[PDB]
Amino acid sequence: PVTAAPPLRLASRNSVFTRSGAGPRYWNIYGYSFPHNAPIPENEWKVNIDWLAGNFADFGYDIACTDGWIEGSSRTTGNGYITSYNDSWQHDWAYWANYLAARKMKLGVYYNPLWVHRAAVEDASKTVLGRPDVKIADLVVPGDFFARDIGGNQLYWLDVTKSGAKEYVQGYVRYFKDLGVPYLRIDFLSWYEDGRDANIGQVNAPHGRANYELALSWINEAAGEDMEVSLVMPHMFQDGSAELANGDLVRINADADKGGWDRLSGMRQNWQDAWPNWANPFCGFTGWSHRNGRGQLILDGDFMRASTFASDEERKTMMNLMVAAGSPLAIADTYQQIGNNAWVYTNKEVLQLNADGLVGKPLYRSATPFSKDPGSRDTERWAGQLPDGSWGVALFNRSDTETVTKTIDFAKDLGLATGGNVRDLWEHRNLGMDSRATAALAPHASAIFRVTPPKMHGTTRYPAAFAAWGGGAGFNYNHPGYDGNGFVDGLQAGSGSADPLVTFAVQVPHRGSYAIRYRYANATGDTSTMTVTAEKADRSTVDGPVHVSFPGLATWDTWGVADGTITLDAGLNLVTIGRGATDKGAINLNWIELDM
């Protein structure tokens, strides 16, 4: 019988955004501003918004988001917060959020709340929100300009050690949240932190890790559950620890830039220790995938520039990768650039994967970090499970020249006993019941499928190797007998601050008590326990925490099935299993099954 348990110690922000599904759908000004190397004029912003309202907002792309080129945004409130995107704009953020509202859309903002504009510093009348004793001028070290070493002289970096700093930063974050902004994109924190860029050299004064982590904690608290926090230049120190603890999204690639295949799949394949660890998103999504999934991080593959690609097959591959990885779906084509390419963004079956909360993983091949061994995960074969037990499966051919067959086998790779109905989502074709998804792919082409296992008496299997991992839990394959490609280990005691865990999203038709099974290994020489909970997306407890017991077995190659019952509510539940301080021993986890 199960006993009551304390809650697990977490190491992620664990917000409603990362718990509820994949990244947001939005449009971004980058397709204008990058090639122009200039802030978007207000009329161009307007014409793009009107175009989105009539053509993409109905497909869920209902955030219009600004980007950089903000040095020319100098006008601020009495507390130093920018009033609009650029000084040339006749209307402020509020006017544009309402204009968007009238078209069933919302405003996304790119800004870093550690930026302090020189114009605000120079106006002695401006003071920190709620702190009339602190002038905005009192927030900065003289000469400490953002991008100082490459000529920057319009934005200071905040000195977070100065009185008023927390109030300034939190006020800035809440300023946008209050304006109705659901998404805040915070860039240049690696430049803030270490004053360096691997593409350039020295860029400005460093501010250090402690200050970076403190600033992130302030931003997290101020954003709360109302506004999604995108970290656009993460250094990802310590396997992304501070970013995971404080943000919702992390960029995993070098900038889209001029777009096309070389930005999607080229440049370099190796890892480096500096921003960005991987250059192309095939490698970055693959390399950071151990940090993805419900309650962990959403990985951000940057912007889609459909018209910069050479063919429609490449455009499909671009979209399929973003969807496979659970990334935000960010259109950067302007109304002038879109041409006849709207279709790439508006395939309803592909979008349905994003709506349903697909967060895929590359096929794991070994436990070794991808940063150390590129053989450890397959950049070209992705799968993820939806809450209802169905799957998204994506197959890619990154060769420039050869046609290559790619296959995901439902038993050997995914770890299912059932096979599944397979639908090709670009052919819009039912392939019927099958044991695998396969495609003979032309160079740069891809295929994406919805795979729907049958459910004899409601049985739904969720493989651990394709779920979300936290606190040290991870993939392995070093004891035989597992179903699928492997299992999760690290569900053991350790020295750390966080408890290792696995999170599964599960969807059920009604509130009730459901039979749950856990296929596991345990050769610790004694009984082991893990803590199990069910929660709503908002974190509220549906069941548990309870200690579930796992009888000791003969060897680490021996697998058993522990039986239990779990209360779940109608719709989405997050079922988390982890090893707390009061748990005993250790297990390896292969899968869970729910009879729904």
Ligand SMILES: OC[C@H]1O[C@H](OC[C@H]2O[C@H](O[C@H]3[C@H](O)[C@@H](O)[C@@H](O)O[C@@H]3CO)[C@H](O)[C@@H](O)[C@@H]2O)[C@H](O)[C@@H](O)[C@@H]1O
């Ligand atoms: O006003 C701020 C900034 O706006 C533009 O840059 C926006 C882009 O900033 C980042 O890109 C940087 C790279 O990460 C660095 O490695 C290096 O190449 O420099 C660029 C910035 O030029 C971010 O990664 C992108 O997603 C943003 O679009 C202007 O280009 C800057 O000059 C302005 O300071």
Ligand SMILES: OC[C@H]1O[C@H](OC[C@H]2O[C@H](O)[C@H](O)[C@@H](O)[C@@H]2O)[C@H](O)[C@@H](O)[C@@H]1O
């Ligand atoms: O404690 C559960 C664990 O037990 C064995 O591994 C022991 C030990 O092996 C290496 O030294 C690792 O670096 C440590 O982290 C492990 O504690 C089983 O082989 C393993 O499957 C299981 O998870």
